[PDB]
Design a protein around this ligand. Structure first.
Ligand SMILES: Nc1ncnc2c1ncn2[C@@H]1O[C@H](COP(=O)(O)OP(=O)(O)OP(=O)(O)O)[C@@H](O)[C@H]1O
Ligand SMILES: Nc1ncnc2c1ncn2[C@@H]1O[C@H](COP(=O)(O)OP(=O)(O)OP(=O)(O)O)[C@@H](O)[C@H]1O
Ligand SMILES: [Mg+2]
Ligand SMILES: [Mg+2]
Ligand SMILES: [Zn+2]
Ligand SMILES: [Zn+2]
Lengths: 78, 297, 295, 38
């Protein structure tokens, strides 16, 4: 869905706004965007709440949390 | 049949507990020579402190250790009750029961890492000078992870060089120590690689912190294959803490911003075991350059 | 207190009475003292180094609870499930007491350096003629908070231990009582050697001490640090009779339950004594003391 | 002898323990205890 995508970009944009701002694209790496550890924690919760699901600990990985793209690929597979 | 197990006979004696061993003269002579080699690389202006195996529980709590590795922490407890209560506890022991129900926590924990006590010490001095501060710290550390593998101890020696300053002070320090530590490992004739890594944080949220840690490349380890190349043993680490300790302890750099910190950590027991695994337990048969570097003659 | 002025050069506060960070100056002297002690080690002495923790069951078996239960530090931890641990952490997060979720491990902080050597020795079968001698060291712990620099909760202990017939142990202790005094004299220290007793807990304990002093099972080398009227014991010379031999089934060369004894050096107390006596400026220390320490 | 030092006859620590205990069995004795009086 373009729904999951644009919504993820929103929560990423919302957490980002808690300090500064930047350009958030799908292939852009989250760490390069400027997300720190508590951001990544907050982002994982802002996604588990947004889509009424729980990420299996098995899927909490740099692979799935690399970029917005890799993240939607995880949200959508559930 | 762990590949390290054969080293026990020459290096250790059992103390009735996995991960807790008496050290032989042979073993300790190499730990001490490794310690002296590390000292020979200490930078001028680095302040050397030696910490005991315990530290303030309140200091450790404030530093956030519980939120990260609650399961590894060893606390000090004691019999703090009245003389009657203590005599009763001992009498229960005499009669086959458990005296430990009379224990309550002290204000101390066993130190899980050498560097923790140095941050409040630094903080008490006021604003950092330009260039920051450097420390050489060491402690017998404790982590509650029993294991029969000789490279995973519950009580082990840690030696660290610690940098406290601006983000640039710290990254420069970590960069130079990553190069030097590799040179040392090379001089010691050890086979190793250096790669990014993460601390084993606790729980599900801990997994995400770890993910972020690896992504930010906050932690490198020097890894030596002891049992296998598939699961090598981390014998040094190069850690960037960002502003975590600076903010916690109210340490301000010379620009008035919350200080960053980082440390290079040497696992003295792991390095010693790496040496005996690599070169054998006969010191006269060690390579000449290695004997030289360690001043074995 | 007379020692207090030494704090600024020797120690940094770690936020707990009797637990101090050691400066490079202080640790350099501890190290030289350790090396000096090593250089007086008797031939045939096996050197072991112990970690700051030991088996709780071994210490229990050694009878430590009948003597100093109030001094013991036990290692405890969060041993529960992830759920239990999470609640404990949650309590802490809220400013609550997470320590109620602690339970005891199978380890204690070592109260003296020699305890773990007795089972090690026993596992080797019967003693050779002339007995066994060990050189041991550990960071020890005793739960006695104090502000005085000579009364620490965490401190280094170094011991020479003898295991053998009564004559072996007795000869060993006499050699070391003379030898220790010669070392103290070479270090420029003021001292006397006197009968002493361990600080046994409780009523019965007070009578254990009297009987200990009466049997002369314990001498101490006492150095005036805060006063001549209350000197500080910096070394002890202990005769245990067959207590550990019997406890651990160690038998001497003649089939009898072995006797044991030890000479204990309090490394932090000796170092503090050196700084109190000679001051914190090493270049000014007397030439014979500098030479003896290899400075 | 009623002059012989108590520890000279062969009364070690556990003997002296029961000796404080035994003297309790006689009278109002609750004995704290010091080296001199023994
Ligand atoms: N259980 C242990 N036994 C021996 N040495 C240890 C142990 N844990 C850590 N060390 C050593 O001390 C250093 C401690 O820093 P660090 O906290 O990075 O360890 P770690 O990341 O927990 O390791 P590991 O993945 O092996 O558990 C390590 O690099 C290692 O050399
Ligand atoms: N709390 C302490 N702080 C520093 N060193 C100590 C402490 N307790 C013991 N030591 C040192 O360890 C040595 C051997 O231990 P030992 O059990 O004989 O001490 P002790 O008899 O309890 O003494 P004290 O009456 O001094 O507390 C002592 O001679 C002393 O030098
Ligand atoms: Mg670990
Ligand atoms: Mg004591
Ligand atoms: Zn560190
Ligand atoms: Zn002893």
């Amino acid at each position: 869905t373009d729904v999951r995508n644009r919504i993820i970009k929103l929560v990423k944009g919302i957490l980002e706004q808690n300090a500064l701002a930047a350009d958030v694209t799908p292939q852009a790496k989250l760490v390069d965007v400027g997300l720190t550890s508590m951001d990544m924690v907050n982002l994982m919760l802002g996604v588990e709440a947004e889509f009424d699901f729980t990420i299996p600990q098995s899927e909490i990985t740099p692979e799935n949390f690399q970029s917005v793209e890799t993240l939607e690929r995880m949200v959508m597979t559930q | 049949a762990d590949p390290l197990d054969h080293l026990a006979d020459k290096l250790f004696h059992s103390m009735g507990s996995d991960g807790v061993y008496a050290r032989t003269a042979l073993y300790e002579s190499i730990v001490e020579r490794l310690a002296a080699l590390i000292t020979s690389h200490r930078e001028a202006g680095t302040e050397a402190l030696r910490f005991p195996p315990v530290m303030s529980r309140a200091q450790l709590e404030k530093s956030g250790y519980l939120k990260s590795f609650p399961n590894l922490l060893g606390c000090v407890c004691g019999l703090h009750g009245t003389e009657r209560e203590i005599n009763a506890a001992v009498s229960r022991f005499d009669a086959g029961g458990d005296w430990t129900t009379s224990l309550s926590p002290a204000d101390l924990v066993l130190s899980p890492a050498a560097c923790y006590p140095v941050y409040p010490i630094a903080a008490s001095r006021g604003p950092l000078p330009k260039g920051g501060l450097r420390f050489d710290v060491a402690a017998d550390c404790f982590r509650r992870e029993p294991s029969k593998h000789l490279d995973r101890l519950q009580s082990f020696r840690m030696r660290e060089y610690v940098c406290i300053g601006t983000p640039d002070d710290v990254s420069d320090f970590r960069e130079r120590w990553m190069v030097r530590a590799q040179a040392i490992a090379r001089d010691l004739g050890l086979t190793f690689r250096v790669d990014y890594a993460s601390d084993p944080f606790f729980g599900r949220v801990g997994q995400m912190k770890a993910v972020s840690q690896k992504q930010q490349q906050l932690k490198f380890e020097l890894l030596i294959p002891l049992r296998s190349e598939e699961q090598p043993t981390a014998c040094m680490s190069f850690n960037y803490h960002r502003e975590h300790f600076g903010t916690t302890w109210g340490i301000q750099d010379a620009n008035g911003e919350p200080a960053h910190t980082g440390c290079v950590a040497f696992g003295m027991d792991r390095l010693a075991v790496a040496m005996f695994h690599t070169h054998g337990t006969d010191l006269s048969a060690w390579p000449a350059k290695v004997r030289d570097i360690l001043g074995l003659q």
